[PDB]
Amino acid sequence: YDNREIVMKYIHYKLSQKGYEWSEVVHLTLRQAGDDFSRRYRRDFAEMSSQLHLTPFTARGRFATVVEELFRDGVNWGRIVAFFEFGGVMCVESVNREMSPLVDNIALWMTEYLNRHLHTWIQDNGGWDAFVELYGP
Numbered sequence: 001y002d003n004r005e006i007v008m009k010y011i012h013y014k015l016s017q018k019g020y021e022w023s024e025v026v027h028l029t030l031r032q033a034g035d036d037f038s039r040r041y042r043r044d045f046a047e048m049s050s051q052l053h054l055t056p057f058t059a060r061g062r063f064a065t066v067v068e069e070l071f072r073d074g075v076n077w078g079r080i081v082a083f084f085e086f087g088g089v090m091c092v093e094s095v096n097r098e099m100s101p102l103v104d105n106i107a108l109w110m111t112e113y114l115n116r117h118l119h120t121w122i123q124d125n126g127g128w129d130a131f132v133e134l135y136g137p
């Protein structure tokens with residue numbers, strides 16, 4: 001599994017499902033899990049999208065701050081879905097505010113975070129195959 005491909009497909013999904021412009025079972029499962037997360041956590045989304053103040057200079061710090069807090073008490077599959085959903089929220093708020101070049105930077109930051117911070121937990125917990133076994137078709 002390629003974390004970059006996982007990230008790229010997810011962001012492309014988040015943007016196109018909202019009218020913006022920019023192995024398959026893993027992508028499909030993540031789409032379903034993330035759509036479920038956004039239906040169940042609507043109030044957390046509205047608060048994040050409204051409170052999140054972004055500029056090309058502070059975007060990485062904003063991303064890093066939220067993601068550290070999300071994973072502070074440990075990693076679980078639910079928290080990883082929330083990480084992709086948070087990444088999607090940043091991408092949508094970046095396009096909304098005409099800072100669209102930030103989308104490519106967010107994809108890079110999400111890819112590095114998966115490869116350097118989440119990779120250990122993912123493999124120790126069965127890999128993406130285990131996520132598909134728990135929540136997929």
Ligand SMILES: CC1(C)CCC(CN2CCN(c3ccc(C(=O)NS(=O)(=O)c4ccc(NCC5CCOCC5)c([N+](=O)[O-])c4)c(Oc4cc5ccnc-5n(COP(=O)(O)O)c4)c3)CC2)=C(c2ccc(Cl)cc2)C1
Pocket residue numbers: 032033034036037040041044045048066069070076077078079081082083085086089135
């Ligand atoms: C950190 C901040 C600064 C502050 C707080 C926030 C908000 N905050 C909201 C709560 N949240 C967590 C954390 C952990 C779990 C958990 O251990 N899930 S889990 O591992 O037990 C688990 C069960 C089910 C599923 N899939 C089930 C579906 C069913 C339909 O088919 C597809 C699979 C998963 N999973 O990984 O897929 C996995 C969790 O529970 C879920 C996860 C889900 C993820 C998806 N749905 C799911 N449901 C909803 O399920 P329930 O009905 O059981 O409530 C509940 C929610 C953390 C983040 C911040 C913020 C972040 C992002 C944005 Cl965009 C905006 C703000 C930022």
